[PDB]
Amino acid sequence: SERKAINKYYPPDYNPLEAEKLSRKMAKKLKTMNKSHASIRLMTPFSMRCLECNEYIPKSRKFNGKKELLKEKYLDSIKIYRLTISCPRCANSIAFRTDPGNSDYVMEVGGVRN
Template sequence: MSERKVLTKYYPPDFDPSKIARTRNTGPKTAGPKTQTVRLMAPFSMKCTSCGEYIYKGRKFNARKETTDEKYLSIPIYRFYIRCTRCSAEITFKTDPKGMDYTCEKGAKRNFEVWRGKEGGGGE
């Protein structure tokens, strides 16, 4: 069992490190011209419109992040694509820098949050 804990490895005398293929892929993967694959947590609790599954805030997803052409005061707006955990339907939401929040676009309905109030203007 002690062989697993070895800190130094044996390199034979004819070892040539230049023959090892190295990849310098740091950062998120790109899946297209403006799309990246990222790991994120659900920013709000939502209900899938196709199967009724509840997806709670903080659930982790592998998502596609797309940079849209829209901007708010020179802040770029991003769109995220995730999949429902039960039926694999696509759910889309994007950032809302004006309201410091996210807006649900397609595939899910945002759950009611008491502290937001009726119009999203506070807790009354």
Template sequence: MARSLRRSDLIGQHARKSGRSDPGPKVQVVRLMAPFSMQCTTCGEYIYKGRKFNARKETPVGEKYLEIQIFRFYIRCTRCSAEITFKTDPKNMDYACEHGARRNYEPWREKCADRLAEEEADQDERGAMEKLEDKMHDARREMDVADALDEIRTRNARRERAGRSGVDISGPVARANQDTVRKEEEETDSAAWLHAQAKAKDAGLIAAVMPAPLPPVLMVAKAAPAKKQGLVKGIKKKEHNDGASKSLVGYESDSDG
């Protein structure tokens, strides 16, 4: 019984020793091929893709990407036996060189460069479109300003033509109508001027180029002075002749008497 107990105790102790878990990362010896071409940073030896190595595979604790475990591999340089490490890269679906060597070609760098080039091209295209839109807006503003100036000039010309015509506008009714029209035109002109000035400021134009419109000149036609009615020359002569004849007739009567 004593011997059997001793044997059972020994078996239990051995089971406890073998059941202890190492808290460090798990390491396995595996046979693999180099996943990419690399150059040793110690001696400068080139290690080409597909070269076979006896490597140590390590499972680091806590290194995961989206719940995907990351593995690390240790190999030796074929020339100087310097340690080289690389690990899996689930993000780019590739391997990443970590220590002891430098990768000759990294495809994600070209992807990043292509993406940056595309973004720059998009920005240039957007900048060109924005410049074109700004030019179109400036042209529209200039056209609006020119239209406002044309309207002001047309109204001024119409006002001058109305003043030059021989219409008698000195009457009270005509004068009241003209004052109303003049006020409306002044309000319209001032509104057009403010609108054009605001658009010119938005377009970056100089406000001094467009002077403020002058107030409309009220053309009042003066009534022609009444002409004095003079005597007709023929009538004057006739009257003189009649007087002379009358005087002559009296003289003859005196001679006769």
């Protein structure tokens, strides 16, 4: 019952491998886990303007974003991500990408950096 709980109770018949298999079988059917744009909490490094309503969301402002994987990676084996945000006033989907060549981000049809 307590966040540092050592052992979760299992039923008396719990073939772990079998259980895993079952879960897998019922993971394609599952709504969540079988989808993109999984949530995340992030502060905004770019400090940018929301292109619709010009709301000047500043640096380090916290948002409940959606992180999604971009299939087209950078180079070969180092992934890059789309990080969706909403502007506070108008609900326009701002987002950005993390191209690690410059050790920084790229704006993605959301707003503009300034």
